[PDB]
Amino acid sequence: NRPVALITMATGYVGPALARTMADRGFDLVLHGTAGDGTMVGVEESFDSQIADLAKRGADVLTISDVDLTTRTGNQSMIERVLERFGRLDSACLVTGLIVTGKFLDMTDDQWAKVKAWNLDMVFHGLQAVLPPMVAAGAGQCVVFTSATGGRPDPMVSIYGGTRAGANGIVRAVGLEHARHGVQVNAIGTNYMDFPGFLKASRADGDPERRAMIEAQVPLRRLGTMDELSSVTAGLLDGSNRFQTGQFFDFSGGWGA
Amino acid sequence: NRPVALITMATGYVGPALARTMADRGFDLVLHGTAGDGTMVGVEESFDSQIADLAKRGADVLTISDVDLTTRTGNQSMIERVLERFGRLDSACLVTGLIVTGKFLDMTDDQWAKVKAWNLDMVFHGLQAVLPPMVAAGAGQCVVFTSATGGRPDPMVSIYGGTRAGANGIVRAVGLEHARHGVQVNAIGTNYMDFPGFLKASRADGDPERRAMIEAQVPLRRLGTMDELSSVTAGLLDGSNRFQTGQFFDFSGGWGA
Amino acid sequence: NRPVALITMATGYVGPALARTMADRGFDLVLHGTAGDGTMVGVEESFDSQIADLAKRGADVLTISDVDLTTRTGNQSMIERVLERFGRLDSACLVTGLIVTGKFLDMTDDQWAKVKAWNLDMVFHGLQAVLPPMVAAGAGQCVVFTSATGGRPDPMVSIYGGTRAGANGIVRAVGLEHARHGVQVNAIGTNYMDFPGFLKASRADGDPERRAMIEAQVPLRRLGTMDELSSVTAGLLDGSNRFQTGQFFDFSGGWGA
Amino acid sequence: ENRPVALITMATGYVGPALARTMADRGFDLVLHGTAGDGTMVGVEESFDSQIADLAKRGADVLTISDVDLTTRTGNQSMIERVLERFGRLDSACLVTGLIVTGKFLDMTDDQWAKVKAWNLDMVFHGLQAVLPPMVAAGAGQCVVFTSATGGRPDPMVSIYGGTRAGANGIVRAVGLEHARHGVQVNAIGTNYMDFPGFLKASRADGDPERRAMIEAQVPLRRLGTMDELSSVTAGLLDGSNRFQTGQFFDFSGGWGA
């Protein structure tokens, strides 16, 4: 009678570390991500490499990689495939968004459209899919990953930070609206995290001297670890804390405080 | 050498009262709005009605009513016709949005698409159209109307309140990004205002019993008047205050405090 | 039968400019401040120089300068003397606080005691004195000046900015608690204002070298003027806007956005 | 053999006992400040004697303190001195503060005003001035200050209590950001609607099922929080597993403060 957790974009970012700790905590897993080995773009840990490790921890695993999570059909199909394999959905970690920066007056209609599809549509369709089975069960926990820029939309990041703020707003209303059914929905927004996504976007991957300058912008003078982020994320998904919902938690070393 | 102020949706809501006071402060006016007389939907004070009154106050008027302000082409066309008649743009008041409410799980793709086009696209394209001339002149003031729900997006107002929070987010980044050019951009969000839009949406029109119940939800126990709102709004557009930018102001009788 | 406005610390900061425009708007005035001519510390415009100008604007004036506004007795006696002369109290502007900075671990018990007395006690006793007559009249407007550091208490400003935040919190509850009696209470917090107080605290006197460094810290690249602040302050005290209460407005050229 | 040390105040009630139990499971030695006496004394939910026995089976040494005034500089300085004398190190500190008062704003007296400042602010000011120097000198430390969820939404009938709580949160933000460069963290947690005697009697929900249900109906998640839950979240900010958050305030009230 093991509980089931869903994690998306799990071939990178916090997915791999989160899966390990959720398996240690007694969960079966459903991992959505990119197919192929490490050479393919956006693949930090392939499906194959993870399955061996997670099985030793005692978790059954299902993989999904042929859905478009910016649409209703992609998210509905993902949850349908979850329920037929395991027949339940206790927790869900929805990783969303795509980074874009630049002057506000240089932004194009394509950039504006891409920001809306990844920062808002993924959240809207994602939540409309995971909530029904949780409401029907009378219990559930969801974490939506947005961005720390949503708490302080700054110049040169207007359309990206601005839409992240709207995503946090949606999570507040949704987390409050379904609380009476025993369901929790919260948001986490990170920045200055140590992984390829942030390193490339901040032009820090090339020069170690530029890395040090970027670290000097964080109050705690370092970049975050995925093991740290997974421990925090799991705390909102493992059933140990059922008294927080509709809230946004900043995770950027004090940058967003 | 009168300055020029642009007001959109000016055939209703705050437009008419704002135009009158702005004319008293020595402004020329460009009014976007809806064509037709009082019997057509969405018109509270027709163009013809305001022309005669605005004339005695000493202001010239240009009307625009054949443009789609959810598009880039529409907003660009609007500003081109402003610069053509008067050759300058000193202040801009952009009214945006369209209300939708209901359970989060009942929302359709059409509702989701409609709220994005009115609450976000109007803001994106609107600002990309009014700023370039202000930056060129080295001075400008802009007010974007969003909604008090952006400050506290609640159950039954998930997608409307959440996207309003994103609009406020964009206005913060933009307001701070163009401040060094002497331009100001701020947002105002209202609720419980006495005008047809809110009265119908709350099912309070023609129902004195319902009206009293609605007013009892407001800390100050009343509905707001357009004369009050126009005075506050004109204060951010008449040149008297030039030390605020990128900020959001709640105007709901304490409801959003 | 003119209305009566009360203004404290009125021999400096926003007092004199606020009294001038409030008189233009038809108010009788009661001014609390420091006695003496420009020689004494903390007096920018003496009582004598002002009463002649304000009388030409058509207002009666009452002066008070022998009360300790960190105590219940001082504030109670101030309002008692106001009702004795005019029998009426319509608006009140309570200027509070005294600035302290430095490392948190270098703060002494006297510094801690002083920030509490000027940032908090003044607000507690001030509001307990002005509200009773406004409640009994069924109408009233109050503005409490705190500081923009209350919105973002930063390092080296711990106990000052921290206590300013507590003052804003008190204004929120009080502003919401008495809204049903037709009374309004809001707060304004400034920074980077052009007046002797702020200039001395930032070592920017007759030294354009550092004042240019200070001005670059503001998004709008300038310092605010009391005529600007006076216009915003008067808007919340002249009866033109009765739909905002329990709110905090930042006025630092975008520094606090 | 080289166990880290954690300080917990007001540990005879509220979250102290449960937090002590899990921090011991995670390998900490403990210094517990609290009230002397058994369960018959007011303010003692779990007595010192009863905790030392259970904490012992978990492999933790314990020091107790109950003769200091934590509203003063002398009390807090004395407390930290006795920590370093016994263990020679301070790794984590959980400072419980404050005292409840409610009622109409215009009915508040000078004694009530003086009381909230001493418990909601002075405890925080003097508390942090005593726990930080050891952590800065070592280059590592974690601190949690318990304030109140009302600090995030100071409401009518809670003016001076909620307002001063918002001030404590502001102080925690500046301090948390000011010492981040030294490798030290300071954050705040603010609760409401917790299942323990302090809240049950302040809300008159004790012994009355119907009133207990009406109180729960004010919580979005329609329940009261347990100390096991709160101690799990609190320990996660004091056990070295998360070192990337500082100067922040976290609401813990079932969504009430969201």
Residue numbers in the entry:
A (entry chain A), B (entry chain D), C (entry chain C): 6 to 262
D (entry chain B): 5 to 262
Copy text verbatim from the article accompanying this structure deposition.
Halohydrin dehalogenases (HHDHs; also, haloalcohol dehalogenases or epoxidases, halohydrin hydrogen-halide-lyases) are biotechnologically relevant enzymes for the production of chiral epoxides and β-substituted alcohols. In their natural function, they catalyze the reversible dehalogenation of vicinal haloalcohols with formation of the corresponding epoxides. HHDHs possess a catalytic triad composed of serine, tyrosine and arginine. Protein engineering of halohydrin dehalogenase HheG for thermostabilization revealed several residues with positive impact on the apparent melting temperature.
Superimposition revealed that mutations T123G and T123W have no effect on the overall fold of the protein or on the position and orientation of the catalytic residues S152, Y165 and R169. A more thorough analysis of the variants shows that mutation of T123 to glycine or tryptophan leaves backbone hydrogen bonds to G102 and K119 unaltered, whereas side chain-specific contacts to L103, K119 and N124 are abolished. In the T123W variant, new hydrophobic interactions of the tryptophan side chain with T75, L103 and M127 are established, which may contribute to the increased thermostability of this variant. The loop of variant T123W displays a significantly higher mobility compared to wild-type HheG and variant T123G, for which a lower loop mobility has been obtained. In summary, the observed average loop position of variant T123W is very similar to the one found in HheG wild-type, while the loop mobility is significantly increased in this variant. Hence, also the ability of the T123W loop to (partially) close the active site cleft is increased compared to wild-type HheG. While the loop consisting of residues 39 to 47 leads to denser packing and increased buried surface area in T123G, it is more flexible in T123W. For the latter variant, the crystal structure indicates specific new interactions of the tryptophan with nearby residues, which might contribute to a higher thermostability of T123W. Moreover, the flexible loop could provide M45 as additional interaction partner for W123. In contrast, exchange of T123 by an aromatic residue yielded the highest gain in thermostability with 12–14 °C increase in Tm.
